[PDB]
Specification:
Chains A, D: This is Phage portal protein, HK97 family. Chains A, D: InterPro entries: Phage/GTA_portal, Portal_HK97. This is part of a larger assembly, with three copies of chain A, three copies of chain B and two copies of chain C. Chain A contains 14 helices and ten strands. Chain A is α+β, with helices and mostly antiparallel strands. In chain A, a hairpin with an 8-residue loop joins strand 5 and strand 6. The two termini of chain A are 50 Å apart. The relative contact order of chain A is 0.13. By secondary structure, chain B is α/β, with parallel strands linked by helices. In chain B, the strands form three sheets. In chain B, strands 5-6-13-9-7-8 form a six-stranded mixed β-sheet. In chain B, strands 1, 4, 10, 11 and 12 form a five-stranded mixed β-sheet that branches. Chain B is built from four helices and 13 strands. Helix content of chain B is 15%, strand content 23%. Chain C is built from four helices and four strands; from the N terminus they run E-H-H-E-E-E-H-H. A four-stranded antiparallel β-sheet of chain C has the order 1-2-4-3, with no helix packed on it. In chain C, helix 2 packs across helix 3. The longest helix of chain C is centred in the first third of the chain and has 19 residues. Classes of the chains: A alpha+beta, B alpha/beta, C alpha+beta. Chains in contact: A-D, A-E, A-G, A-H, B-C, B-D, B-H, C-F, D-E, E-F, F-G, G-H. At the D-E interface, helix 7, strand 8, helix 8, helix 9 and helix 11 of D face helix 1, helix 3, helix 4 and helix 7 of E.
């Protein structure tokens, strides 16, 4: 905070700081463009919305606004964090405490203002040429700004799609390689070469319609596969091939489809990409998914809702994921109940306090 | 490990007043004269006895720069940093002693010296030895001792001699009428480092014994000479300008002249 | 990098009186009749064919090498190979202030790769827009006699050929024109970034 | 100590020492550039934040400042250690004990000052051309400087990304090899060579629009795949191939994608890179991850928070990782509870004291 | 030596990705003569039909009419993968061999020598960690005892170090299953204070 | 990109009196001028053959380069290679108004890449539906003597051929017509997008 | 210097938005081929 | 009636390496602008 004043002047106080320009184009080319970048965010954002929470405040979260439910809110919230590294939540307060409206402001059209002491004073929702200038020079601070970790930038997040932005363009263009190869390719199944007495000679349109009708009827198609095809003088049939037949950038697409899944943190088994068996039997890969890239993400966002929404209340509230009755963690729950349940030496109430039960 | 020539290190930095300054210049403020108070008469007007006219001397705080081009046995970054710090420690030593006004600290030798006994404020005082070539032939070291005792008892609490090596050579070459080495008597003694009870600073940028040269100085340089400087050293590890040569940029800024003209006394080898 | 010559040959430096002797001396029709100034026009055409294939200079004419950006950090190989004594490395700016430099560089002469090779790692940088410009004198010697005589014979084997037959008419010698040139061509194997 | 006093005057007392030149460029090319270097830091920094701690002081750690939570602090802290080998924590102390502000200062813009006796006196936060000069000539010492181990340097860390800086540039350029190969490549599916009566001859633009329209309509595309393609005199069809089809630096990227994961110490199974099965079934590789590169890293930073923050208190506090109810170490907890629980010879209270239980 | 193989084989592939000109083909234009350039009118025509209609992913496979003189020779890139791939992977194991880490712990690829990390972590703390630590701690036990009066021993714990649990299961279940000898007779074996 | 010539060569600058010395017509006849109408008809037919194989200019006549869209964002390499002193980049509009622009464009002289690179990182913009013609005078020199002599010889080897055989009748030199041309052709290896 | 640059650019481009020509700077509306209104066409701006 | 296209940042940068006794700051922003709709701007001519 003491050094906060020094970085603020360099950027320029009172003026909007934009950060990354090409953020909106990674969405259309990397999330609406390829299925791997599409499925990876949809797999996470529909997983963090499904996790229950532990606190009143959750009555706001259950019904944030019209037409945007509890689970639909976090899909919009985490879906901006995975896409552009930043999450925004406007609170509309007709009432003084616990404001009854939440709105995920998209992070394409939002810009920060550094202000005096380096910590932000303005946020600017910029649609068309129109700005809004939300104000942070107050106590309730009407927008929570959830940052992904960015080491070099002081105001935004890193957005894992930016780290995979080369592997998206490999997977977008290798998939479009095979598309435009199926659309721009002339393979013939042969060529009836007609030289003539000279090195060059055309055949007359009388002879040419004769050549079609014996080729149309008697030689093309499945039903004429293999006629013995008499070739008189001058004529010759050179059969062409198609030498790379399968596998046009097949492994570099399948390797880039795994590096996209690597950056968002989904395992290759969940998304459905082919590859070597790393995880075994989905009791691991679903448990690894909710432990390395979902529950760390959800306990970081819920820790920002636990502090931003407590600024509207008087008492501070904690708000964490449940990490109980989330059915992907049952292999960590069998393993912990059967450990203490088999420990017969310590008594009955001495293990209800370990497994989390109210003792009797 | 790459070697280099070992140069002299003693630099007048450790006996002069080193002041960390941050602005463009350092202004020392010295009064030139006395109060002039008289014994009052019992029936007299008795008014406006006098007032010391003050004077601001400006330490300009110049800058020093050396710019080498870099052009895995030994590592250049550490070695060139250990050479350019030595060159900045040695090149400012020449400016502290015989620097002139232009873009560099003016050394204490370049301050319009006046013979002692006719000493005014704007100058430095000297004492003559005798014959112009060297010390006096009849009584050597009389110039040294009256150089000591022609300074002032308040500055001689912590004062030091400033010479180079081959003037301390010519001092230790002084001998009595039997040839017994007035300073450090035997051939087994060494540098006694306490000339006339005062320390000796072998600063190589002093001139040697010549026809009129001021090869021996003596003073409390803590009051006399003020080195005002900034402690850091700029390190531009430059990866541009020339791909072939790194061309590191290193600079230290430093200034200084005399603050007190009474502290330093010089030995003129003339009549 | 324009590299125009400052001055051409005088013409009186060329061995026209000797080339008449390589054309028909000791055997021949007589001295015969040859348009003298024609024979000077075939020597200048045979030297300029061997100045291009060998990248040599052969008469020690004055050059002006005006190029915008330094290729390496410090090296700057000069193209015309047998060099001596940079006249000046004056440095013009985008407006034409033409401030010469007199130190910071030491021409390292060589028939293979003549260089500029500044001291340390700092070679004079270029004013933005203000092309650097190097004037030098490149070649063997001032007169025709200072040349390597095998290269001089490649001129006489070639300038006589342009004299003996005019149009491009057809006609394998052991040391022909081509075999005398190949020890003076520049042998380079770099197609790379440095 | 005594050696340090000599070391200072060699480098220069009172002057800033910068250290690494390229650490601002390895972040953009190695952490925002490739997914493997991105995920590897995110896998560790989100793991050290999840580990609980054992001690008041932790009330500061739970809520350091506005907009920067407990888990968000260590992601910023370890995310600077893995990136640039140095961690920094500014403390703002309005109050004398337990200062209520912590700030992860980024290590790009921080520089040390050796001072007199070799141990540091100044740290310089330099953004733009503007400095701060934090002071270490006092007892509370307002910045904890967490060093990674560096054998050659006396003031900084080694930053594992610097050790993997060759394998990053292989993985960045091999992935960009396949991108620009899919973007700069002209493969044809053939070539209709038209020589003519001469060795060379063009065909007139009347004939050329006839040649396009019989190629556009009747030969290209999926629906025209394999027409018999009559070639009269002069015309000829040479089908081209594409001889390296897949696998452009496929294994050298995948070997470099493993050496990046090798340097930070994550196992290949957790991050999702392909490779031979080293670990078996994720009960090991997650346990190896929280034992070779997380908990040694976390017990080293927590040992520095236990000493820097105790300089603000009167009594010294220990602060260590929990090494209990961290669910990757459950296989080390099954193995130790079933060993002593099955040891029936020693009595009931004699094994509650071994497993860490409150005795009864 | 094995470091300089691994440093230079890894820098081989780096500078190969940075110094390499592969083309995906070459449009050869000979002409009527053996040599002939094409005019800058014709050359900008040749770029614009190559820039627009033939390069890129979206133009992959256009039929590419070649008139007289022109010809397209597609180039390859004959060693594609695996530039010193096994000699790097063999030198990366010999570096790990000298310091004594097993290949499974560090993460290098290779044949399965150790099985399931209960061995390779136990082998690591028995062949190259605990012999190293008991040698340094034996020097601290003697150098620091020179400042004290009484000599002090100082050894690794070799207990509650969680990599040695397979040597601790194996020794507790051996003596715990030996039911013939009594209760205090095996507390003295496993290291417990007897009761 | 049209690249027409503003003015042609004067014809009096061509060395018809020296080409006649080359072809061995005759020395002291009283007629001496029956071929003047045709000798420069083959010199203009051999220069224009070598101006297209080398993309050089050789007489430094004035050009007009009328183009519409810039080839690259800032560079704009000119086709005719040996240039000097680009006169005017007058920027015409969609229709009519022609406004000459100083515009902050430079000229990088080279025999290989005669660029017109801009200094403000973007050449002057182009009114949509309007061309940008560039007047520039490109060539070696004004008179015939300022040429490289080997290229001047390649005109004399070629225009002598057209004088000696009229129709395409078939008929190996060390430095023939072709081997003198080849150090003046443009060596390019880009078929790419940029 | 950042404050004076940010003050200078928002005024230099403000003058460009009004009276700047087409080439080298953004063109302003007052520089465009205007015609009297009633005689209005698309390739112009109208005046009265 | 008037569209402004711009890169919305004031990038500012020090580089002492160009002029070595100096610092030589450099800030840059790029803005482009013309009229979108010609039927949406009218002007007053003070002539007739």
């Amino acid at each position: 905070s003491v050094t906060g004043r020094i970085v603020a002047m360099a950027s320029g106080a009172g003026r909007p700081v934009w950060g990354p320009r090409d953020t909106v184009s990674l969405m259309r080319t990397g999330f609406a463009g390829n299925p791997v970048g599409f499925r990876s965010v949809k797999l996470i954002a529909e997983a963090t919305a499904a996790v229950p929470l532990i606190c009143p405040v959750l009555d706001l979260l259950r019904r944030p606004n019209a037409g945007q439910g509890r689970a639909e809110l976090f899909e919009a919230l985490i879906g901006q964090i995975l896409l552009s590294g930043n999450g925004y939540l406007e609170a509309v307060c007709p009432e003084p405490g616990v404001p009854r409206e939440l709105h995920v402001l998209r992070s394409d059209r939002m810009a920060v203002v550094p202000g005096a002491d380096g910590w932000p004073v303005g946020y600017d929702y910029t649609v068309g040429g129109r700005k809004h200038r939300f104000d942070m020079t107050g106590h309730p601070d009407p927008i929570c700004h959830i940052k992904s970790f960015h080491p070099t930038d002081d105001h935004y997040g890193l957005s894992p799609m930016q780290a995979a932005a080369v592997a998206l363009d490999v997977h977008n263009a290798a998939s479009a390689w095979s598309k435009a190869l199926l659309d721009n390719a002339a393979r013939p199944s042969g060529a009836i070469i007609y030289k003539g007495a000279d090195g060059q000679g055309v055949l007359a349109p009388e002879q040419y319609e004769r050549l079609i009708f014996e080729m149309e009827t008697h030689h093309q198609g499945a039903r004429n596969a293999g006629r013995p095809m008499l070739l008189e003088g001058g004529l010759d049939w050179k059969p062409m091939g198609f030498s790379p037949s399968d596998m046009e950038f097949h492994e570099t697409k399948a390797a880039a489809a795994r590096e996209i899944a690597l950056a968002f943190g989904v395992p290759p088994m969940l998304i459905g990409i082919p590859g070597d068996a790393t995880y075994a039997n989905y009791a691991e890969a679903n448990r690894a998914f909710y432990r390395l890239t979902v529950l760390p993400l959800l306990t970081r966002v819920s820790a920002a809702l636990a502090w931003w929404l407590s600024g509207y209340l008087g008492a501070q509230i904690e708000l964490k994921p449940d990490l109980d009755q989330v059915p992907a963690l049952a292999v960590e729950r069998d393993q912990l109940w059967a450990r203490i349940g088999a420990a017969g030496f310590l008594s009955n109430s001495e293990k209800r306090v370990l497994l989390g039960l109210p003792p009797t | 490990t790459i070697r280099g020539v070992l140069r002299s290190t003693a630099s007048l930095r450790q006996i002069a007043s080193v002041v960390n300054v941050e602005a463009t210049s350092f202004d020392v403020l010295v009064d030139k004269t006395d109060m002039g108070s008289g014994w009052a008469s019992e029936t007299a007007a008795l008014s406006e006895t006098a007032t010391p006219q003050i004077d601001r001397i400006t330490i300009p705080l110049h800058e020093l720069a050396a710019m080498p081009k870099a052009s895995s046995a030994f590592d250049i970054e550490t070695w060139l940093a250990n050479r350019i710090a030595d060159k900045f420690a040695r090149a400012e030593a020449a400016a502290f002693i015989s620097g002139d006004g232009v873009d560099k600290p003016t050394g204490f030798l370049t301050k319009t010296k006046v013979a002692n006994g006719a000493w005014a404020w704007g100058s430095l005082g000297y004492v003559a030895t005798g014959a112009a070539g060297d010390f006096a032939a009849v009584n050597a070291s009389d110039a040294v001792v009256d150089l000591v005792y022609a300074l002032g008892a308040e500055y001689r609490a912590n004062a030091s001699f400033v010479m180079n090596s081959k003037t301390a050579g010519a001092v230790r070459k002084m001998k009595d009428a039997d040839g017994r080495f007035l300073w450090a008597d035997s051939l087994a003694a060494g540098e006694p480092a306490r000339l006339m009870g005062y320390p000796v600073l072998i600063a190589e940028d002093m001139p040697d014994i010549a026809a009129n040269a001021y090869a021996i100085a003596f003073g409390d340089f803590g009051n006399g000479y003020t080195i005002a400087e900034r402690p850091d050293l700029r390190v531009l590890r430059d990866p541009f300008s020339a791909k072939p040569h790194v061309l590191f940029y290193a600079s230290k800024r430093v200034g200084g002249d005399v603050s007190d003209f009474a502290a330093i006394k010089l030995l003129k080898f003339a009549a | 990098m324009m590299l125009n010559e400052v001055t051409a040959v005088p013409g009186t430096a060329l061995p026209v009186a000797e080339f008449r002797d390589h054309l028909r001396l000791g055997t021949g029709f007589a001295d015969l009749g040859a348009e003298d100034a024609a024979l000077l026009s075939y020597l200048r055409a045979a030297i300029a064919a061997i100045e291009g294939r060998t990248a040599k200079a052969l008469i020690s004419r004055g050059f002006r090498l005006a190029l915008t950006a330094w290729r390496w950090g410090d090296m700057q190989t000069l193209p015309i190979a047998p060099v001596a004594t940079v006249t000046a490395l004056r440095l013009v700016d985008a407006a034409g202030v033409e401030t010469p430099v007199a130190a910071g560089w030491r021409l390292v002469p060589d028939m293979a790769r003549p260089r500029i090779e500044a001291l340390g790692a700092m070679l004079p940088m270029i004013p933005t827009g203000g092309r650097v410009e190097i004037d030098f004198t490149a070649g063997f010697g001032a007169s025709w006699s200072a040349l390597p005589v095998d290269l001089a014979q490649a001129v006489f084997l070639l300038a006589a050929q342009y004299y003996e037959l005019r149009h491009d008419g057809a006609a394998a010698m052991p040391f022909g024109v081509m075999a005398l040139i190949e020890r003076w061509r520049t042998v380079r194997v770099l197609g790379g970034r440095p």
